[PDB]
C-alpha cells in the first residue's frame, strides 16, 4: 500500500532557501501517524550550503545534535560568556544546546556542505523557532520586538545608531557568500567548559559490527559520552556495500530515526498490526539520498544496497539497547532458543532448525541475492 | 453509581486462546477515563496455561515484568547472544526487556499456571504487539514479511527449505501440549549478564507490615534492585486473612495497579471530585479472582476480605513513596497532627481526638466488623 | 493584540474563601494555549491569610513547593510517623510531598500572610484535589466516604463517638481564627529524616547577579539541593529597583513561571511565530501584585519596574540552564559572536558592532529610559 515509516526527501519543506543554501525541516512525525507519538519531540533538519558560505548566527528553543553528512565545516557555538569553534568533517557530530547561538561555515572551496540535525524542542512538543539577532530578507532581528526606550537604555545609545548598526536588513537571506580571506579569518580559531561540549567522531574507534559487506559504528549513552547519557540517545553510522544486505534484525528497545546520507537501497520493515486478529504486514521503501525512515523498537528490518549506502541513525530510548539479529551466526536470537523449544514452535525438528540456522556462517551483513 | 477504578476480569479480552491456555489483555486504562492518563503506558496481561503446556517463543515491543500468581513455571529469556531459564514459583517476578524472546513452560503435572504481566510499550503509548518467529493458527511468523530473495541470502538456503523448516504453520495455536519427556528436557537447564536479570522473590525477606490479620511484602526501587530503580516502580504482595480489614490508608506518591490473584473481598476507595464545590465520593467493588483495580496516589482505601485475599500491586512513581494510614497505632498521620491543630479542625477537643485515636492499639490490619 | 504568556491575578479562581483567607488556583496553562503543554502539570496556588489564622490540615495528590511571598508563617508537615514545624519568613521555600499533611499558621499579629505554591499533580496531568481529614462548610472529611462498619473496626469505637469527635462539621471553612494563646502553643515546636526536608532560603548566599539597579538570587538543581535535582527545577528571586530595567535576556533551556509578589512593572517578551514566513512578535504586560507570566526558554524578555518589583520564578527543565543576555558587558552572547561573523550578519561593520556593544559597560540591570 503506502508506508508510514518512510519519509522521502520530498517530505522535507524548506524554511529558508536561496542561491547559497537551504535549511529544510522534516514534518512532525505525529502529523503522520499516532504510531509516532513517542517520536513527536524530534524534528530532523537538513542543511545544504555551497562553498564559501556561512549560515548566520541563530539560536533555537530546541536542543540540537548536528552531524556532518558530507564535506567540511567550521561550526561555532556561543553562550553568554564563551565561544568555541570546531572544524568538523563528515561523521563528526556536535551537540548545540538550546539557546546557544551557533553558526556554520562551509570550509571547502568547491564542495557543498550537507549537515543533518536532530532538533528537540523545549517549549512546545515538536515545534521550535530559530532566533536571529540580525535582520534579513527571510526574518527580522528579535531585537526589533523590544521598544525604542528599552533598546536605548540597553545599549546606551540612540535608536538611530542601534538600528543602523544592528537592526537594519543589511539582501540574500540567512546563508551568505563569504570572501576567501574572511573564510581564512573565520577558520583561524578552529579546533581540528560551560556546557559547550566538544564534537565527537561517530567513527572514532573500531566499529561494533565489521565484515567485507558492511560496517556499523555506534556511540552509546555512556560514561564516556555523558551527553548521550543525559539524553538517553545513541548515534549510529552504517556503511553497506553495493550489492550487500544487512541481515534481518531489530533493536530491542531503541526507536531510531535513520537518515540516508549517500547511496541507494531498498528497505524492508516488518510490523504486526490489527486487522482481534493480528497480521504480519511488510513495508518497503526505495531509499535515496536525503530520505528518512523510522525503525520502531522490536520491528524486524533488512536493508539492501543497490549502490554504496551510508545511513546515519539517531536512537531514542537507547540505554541498554540490543541490536538483535535473526540470521547468521552472531547476535542470532533464534539460535539461542532451546532446541526442544525450536522443535515445538517450528514445523521442522529441532535438528533441522539448528541445521538450517547454521547454514549461514557469516554474521550481520552478507551478499544480497 | 459505577466505578472507574475497578476492572472486573470480564473487562479482559483474550488475544490468544485455546484448549491449552489463554492470554488476556486488560483494556487501555485511558480508554476508560482521563483520570488514568498517567497510567496509559501500562497494560496488564494474565496468562493461564494447563499442565505440561508451553507458551511459544515471542518477543514484544514492550518492557515487561512477569509475576507468578499461581503454580510453577520455567521461564526462559533470550537475547542475541545468551539465554537463561528460571524455575519460577508463585510470588517470584521476572523482568523481560523489550525485544527479548521469552517462553513459558508450566512445570507442574496437574496444576494450572497463572501468570500476571505488566507490559510497558515502547513505540506507541499503551499499545504493543507480540512477534513470533514461528507460524501458527493464531499468527504468522514475522519472517514471512521478508521477501524470498532476502530470506535466501539471509539463511543461505532456498525458499523451500526455509519455508518448510521455519515458515510453515506446523494446528493448536501459541500455547501447546508438551510431552512428559520434553518437559524434563526443557527444565534440565533451569535455575531454582547481558541485561538478562535474575528473578526476584516478592516475599523474600521480612514483610514490611505483619500481624495476625495481614501481611505486606514490598520490593522498592533500590540499590538492591536497580531495575526497579531504573523504572521508578515497586512490587507489592498483600495477604489479608478471611474476615480481616486492611485499615484506611493511601500511598503518598505512588499510583498502583492491583491484581486480585486469589480470594474475595470488598474495596472501598475515597476520592474528592468536582460537582467550584468539591465533594467526597465513595467507590466500592466486590473483588474476585482475576479482577484489577487502580489505587491513585493520596486517595484513601480500605479492603475487607471475605475469604483469604491475595493482591499483587504494580506501583508507578514509586520512589520515596509512603504508605500512610489513617487509623491504628503505626503509620497513622492523624496522630501526627498537633493536638492544638486537632482541636481547631475536628469537632471534638484535642484530648477527645487523641483519646479516640488511641482506642485502636493495633496497626494496619484488624478484624473486620 | 492579547498575550498568552500573561495571567493577571483576575485569572485566579478562589477554591476556598472567607473572612479569614482564601486559596486561589490559577487555571491550567494548557487550557490557555497549546504552547504550554510542557507546563500543564504545574498549577500555581496563592494563599492569603489574616493575622492569627490557620489553614487547616490537608494533603493533596500533588507534589508541592511552597514559598512565602509576604509575612511570617509556621508551616507543619506530617507523614505517618513524623512531624516537623518550621517558622518561615518571606523568601523561604518548603517542599511538601504528595500525600503528606500540612497546615499553615500566620504567626504575625497584624500582617497578612501571602504564600505562593507550585503544585505538581500525580494522578491526572494538571489536576489535583486537597484531602481534609476534618469536615467543614467548604468540604467533607474523606473519612465520611468509608462505611459505618469500616469506620467502627478501624478506630475501635462506635459510629456515634467517631462522628461526633471526627466526622462532624464543627462554621467558618478551611481557614480559621486562632487564639493568641493557641498561636503560642502552635509555635512552641517551631524551628527558625523521612522525606520531610528542611526549608531553604531563596536568598541564602550571595546573589548570582547584583548591581545598584537589581538583584537575582537563584537556587539550582544541585548536589547542594538534591530535591531540586530530583525535580529538575530551580527557584529564582528577583528584585528590580524602581525606575530600573532588567536587560533583554533569556534562559537557554529552562521554562519559567514567574509570580509577581510585590510592585509594578512592564513586561516585554519577544517570540518568533508562523504567519512558511516566520515573524517577530512582541508581547507586553502591565505587571501587578499577584500576576503570573510564562517565560518560555530561549525567548527574549526585558522587564521595567515602575515601583520596586519583586518576582519569584519556578523553573522547569532547569538543569544546565544559562540565563543569557543580549546587552551590557556580562553574559552578553552577542559580544561572543566572532567579529567577522558580526560583520556578515549585521548591517554595521564588525568594528561598529563591537563599538556599539561596548557602549553599555554595566551588566544585567540598568536605569530605565
Ligand atoms: Cl539498525
Ligand atoms: Cl496498598
Ligand atoms: Cl529571568
- Of B157, B191, B225, the position where a domain reaches its end is B191
Residues B234 and B138 in one domain: no
Question: Does C219 contact B at CB distance below 8 Å?
Answer: no
Alpha carbon separation from B36 to A76, B4, B27, B303, C120 (Å, rounded): 46, 9, 12, 21, 16
C320-349 residues touching B, CB cutoff 8 A: none
List chain C residues with CB under 8 Å of B273.
129
- Cβ neighbours, 10 Å, residue C206: 9
Question: Does B30 contact C at CB distance below 8 Å?
Answer: no
- Cβ neighbours, 10 Å, residue A1: 5
Is A336 within 8 Å of B129 when comparing Cβ atoms?
no
CB-CB contact of C52 with C109 (8 Å) = yes
The residues after which chain B has a C–N gap greater than 2.5 Å are 170, 192, 275
Residues B31 and B16 in one domain: yes
Residues C97 and C147 in one domain: yes
Is B337 within 8 Å of C83 when comparing Cβ atoms?
yes
Torsional sign, CA C143, C144, C146, C147: positive
Name the strand (E) or helix (H) holding C287: strand C278-287
Q: Which domain holds residue A347?
A: 197-365
Which residue among B99, B145, B194 sits closest to A281, beta carbon to beta carbon?
A: B145
Among residues A320, A338, A222, A318, which one has the least CA distance to residue B193?
A320
Place of cell 474563601: C17
Question: Does C33 contact A at CB distance below 8 Å?
Answer: no
All residues at 6 or more sequence positions from A51 whose CB lies less than 8 Å from its CB, including other chains = A106, A108, A109, A110, A111, A112
Any alpha helices (H) in B156-259, and if so which ranges?
Answer: 159-162, 180-187, 226-231
**Environment class of A160 (CB within 10 Å of its CB; exposed 0-12, middle 13-18, buried 19+):** exposed
d(CA C295, CA C3): 12
- Of B144, B159, B191, the position where a domain reaches its end is B191
Is B123 within 8 Å of A345 when comparing Cβ atoms?
no
Alpha carbon separation from B80 to A274, A363, C270 (Å, rounded): 27, 12, 52
**Environment class of A85 (CB within 10 Å of its CB; exposed 0-12, middle 13-18, buried 19+):** buried
CB pairs under 8 A between A and C: 210
Is B79 within 8 Å of A324 when comparing Cβ atoms?
yes
Alpha carbon separation from C215 to C173, C225, C324, C364 (Å, rounded): 39, 21, 16, 9
Residues B150 and B257 in one domain: no
Residues C158 and C210 in one domain: no
Residues B118 and B201 in one domain: no
Ligand nearest to the CA of A325: 1
Residues C12 and C138 in one domain: yes
**Environment class of B5 (CB within 10 Å of its CB; exposed 0-12, middle 13-18, buried 19+):** buried
Torsional sign, CA B286, B292, B298, B303: positive
The SS3 of residue B26 is: strand
- Cβ neighbours, 10 Å, residue A123: 23
d(CA A84, CA A196): 7
How many Cα atoms within 13 Å fall on the side-chain side of residue B149? Answer: 10
State CA C329 to chain mean position distance. 30
Residues C69 and C12 in one domain: yes
> What cell numbers appear for B13 in the block?
479480552
Is A345 within 8 Å of B178 when comparing Cβ atoms?
no
Quick one: three-class SS letters along chain A?
CCCCCEECHHHEEEEEECCCEEEEEECCHHHHCHHHHHHCCCEEEEEEECCCEEEEEEEECEEEEEEEEECCEEEEEECCCCEEEEEECCCEEEEECCCCEEEEEECCCCCCEEEEEEEEECCECCECCEECCCCCCCCCCHHHHCCHHHHHHHHCCCHHHHHHHHHCCCCCCCEEECCHHHHHHHHCCCECCCCCCCCEECCCCCCCEEECCEEEEEECCCCCCHHHHHHCEEEEEEEECCCEEEEEEEECCCEEEEEEEECCEEEEEEEEEECCCEEEEEEEEEECCCCEEEECCCCCEEEEECCCEEEEEEEECCCCCCEEECCCCCCEHHHHCCHHHHHHHCCCCHHHHHHHHHCCCCCCEEECC
Place of cell 531498498: A266
DSSP string, C306-341: SS-EEEEEEEES-TT--EEESSSSTTBHHHHS-HHH
Among residues B239, B248, B233, which one has the least CA distance to residue B64?
B233
Residue B350 carries which DSSP code? H
d(CA C127, CA B34): 11
Is B327 within 8 Å of C166 when comparing Cβ atoms?
no
List chain A residues with CB under 8 Å of B77.
none
Distance C158 CA to ligand 2 centre (A): 25
- Of B172, B191, B210, the position where a domain reaches its end is B191
Instruction: Report the CATH number at residue B310.
Output: 2.60.120.10
Residues C210 and C122 in one domain: no
Among residues A259, A260, A254, which one has the least CA distance to residue A315?
A254
The residues after which chain A has a C–N gap greater than 2.5 Å are 170, 192, 275
The SS3 of residue B165 is: helix
All residues at 6 or more sequence positions from A36 whose CB lies less than 8 Å from its CB, including other chains = A4, A29, A30, A294, B124
List chain A residues with CB under 8 Å of B182.
340, 343-344
Residue B342 carries which DSSP code? H
Which residue among B150, B154, B170 sits closest to A347, beta carbon to beta carbon?
A: B170
Q: How was this structure determined?
A: X-ray
All residues at 6 or more sequence positions from A86 whose CB lies less than 8 Å from its CB, including other chains = A74, A75, A76, A77, A94, A190, A191, A198, A199
> What cell numbers appear for A166 in the block?
544592528
Any alpha helices (H) in C49-155, and if so which ranges?
Answer: 148-155
Place of cell 552472531: A330
Is C165 within 8 Å of B347 when comparing Cβ atoms?
yes
B92-151 residues touching A, CB cutoff 8 A: 97-101, 103, 122-125, 129-135, 139-147, 149-150
Rg for chain C, CA atoms, rounded: 24
d(CA C129, CA C254): 27
Is B165 within 8 Å of A348 when comparing Cβ atoms?
yes
Residues B181 and B239 in one domain: no
The residues after which chain C has a C–N gap greater than 2.5 Å are 170, 192, 275
All residues at 6 or more sequence positions from A176 whose CB lies less than 8 Å from its CB, including other chains = A20, A53, A54, A56, C344, C345
The SS3 of residue B238 is: strand
Count of domains forming chain A: 2
Residues A154 and A14 in one domain: yes
Distance between A256 CA and the closest CA of chain B, angstroms: 10
Residues A309 and A187 in one domain: no
CB-CB contact of C343 with C246 (8 Å) = no
Alpha carbon separation from C136 to B250, B274, B335, C61, C133 (Å, rounded): 22, 17, 20, 20, 10
Q: Mutate one of B299, B317, B330, B345 to test the C interface: name it (highest C CB count within 10 A).
A: B345
- Against chain C, the chains showing at least 3 CB pairs within 8 Å are A, B
Which residue among A323, A337, A340 sits closest to B101, beta carbon to beta carbon?
A: A337
d(CA B27, CA B11): 7
The resolution, in angstroms to one decimal, equals: 2.3
Which residue among C268, C326, C337 sits closest to A57, beta carbon to beta carbon?
A: C337
Which residue among A253, A338, A357 sits closest to B76, beta carbon to beta carbon?
A: A338
B230-269 residues touching C, CB cutoff 8 A: 245, 247-248, 250-253, 255, 268
> What cell numbers appear for A102 in the block?
551557533
Q: Mutate one of C14, C17, C156 to test the B interface: name it (highest B CB count within 10 A).
A: C156
Amino acid at each position: 500500500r503506502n508506508n508510514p515509516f518512510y519519509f522521502p526527501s520530498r517530505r522535507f519543506s524548506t524554511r529558508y532557501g536561496n542561491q547559497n543554501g537551504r535549511i529544510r525541516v522534516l514534518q512532525r512525525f505525529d502529523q503522520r501517524s499516532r504510531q509516532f507519538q513517542n517520536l513527536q519531540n524530534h524534528r530532523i533538519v537538513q542543511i545544504e550550503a555551497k562553498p564559501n558560505t556561512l549560515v548566520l548566527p541563530k539560536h533555537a528553543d530546541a536542543d540540537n545534535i548536528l552531524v556532518i553528512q558530507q564535506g567540511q565545516a567550521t561550526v561555532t557555538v556561543a553562550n553568554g560568556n564563551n565561544r568555541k569553534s570546531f572544524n568538523l568533517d563528515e561523521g563528526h557530530a556536535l551537540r548545540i544546546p538550546s539557546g546557544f547561538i551557533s553558526y556554520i561555515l562551509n570550509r571547502h572551496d568547491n564542495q557543498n556542505l550537507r549537515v543533518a540535525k536532530i532538533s528537540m524542542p523545549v517549549n512546545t512538543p515538536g515545534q521550535f523557532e530559530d532566533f536571529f539577532p540580525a535582520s534579513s530578507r527571510d526574518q527580522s532581528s528579535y531585537l526589533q520586538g523590544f521598544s525604542r526606550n528599552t533598546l536605548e537604555a540597553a545599549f546606551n545609545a540612540e535608536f538611530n545608531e542601534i538600528r543602523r548598526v544592528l537592526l537594519e536588513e543589511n539582501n540574500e537571506g540567512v546563508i551568505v557568500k563569504v570572501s576567501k580571506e574572511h573564510v581564512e579569518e573565520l577558520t583561524k580559531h578552529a579546533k581540528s567548559e560551560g556546557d559547550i561540549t566538544n564534537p565527537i567522531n561517530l567513527r572514532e574507534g573500531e566499529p561494533d559490527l565489521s565484515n567485507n559487506f558492511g560496517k556499523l559504528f555506534e556511540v552509546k549513552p555512556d560514561k564516556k559520552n555523558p551527553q548521550l547519557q543525559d539524553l538517553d540517545m545513541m548515534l549510529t553510522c552504517v556503511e553497506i556495500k553495493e550489492g550487500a544486505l544487512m541481515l534481518p534484525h531489530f533493536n530491542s528497545k531503541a526507536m531510531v530515526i535513520v537518515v540516508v546520507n549517500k547511496g541507494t537501497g531498498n528497505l524492508e520493515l516488518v510490523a504486526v498490526r490489527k486487522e482481534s486478529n493480528r497480521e504480519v504486514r511488510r513495508y518497503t521503501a526505495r531509499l535515496k539520498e536525503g530520505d528518512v525512515f523510522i525503525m520502531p523498537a522490536a520491528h524486524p528490518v533488512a536493508i539492501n544496497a543497490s549502490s554504496e549506502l551510508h545511513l546515519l541513525g539517531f536512537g531514542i530510548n537507547a540505554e541498554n539497547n540490543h541490536r538483535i539479529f535473526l540470521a547468521g551466526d552472531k547476535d542470532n536470537v533464534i539460535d539461542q532458543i532451546e532446541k526442544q523449544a525450536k522443535d515445538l514452535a517450528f514445523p521442522g525438528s529441532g535438528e533441522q532448525v539448528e541445521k538450517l540456522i547454521k547454514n549461514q556462517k557469516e554474521s550481520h551483513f552478507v551478499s544480497a541475492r
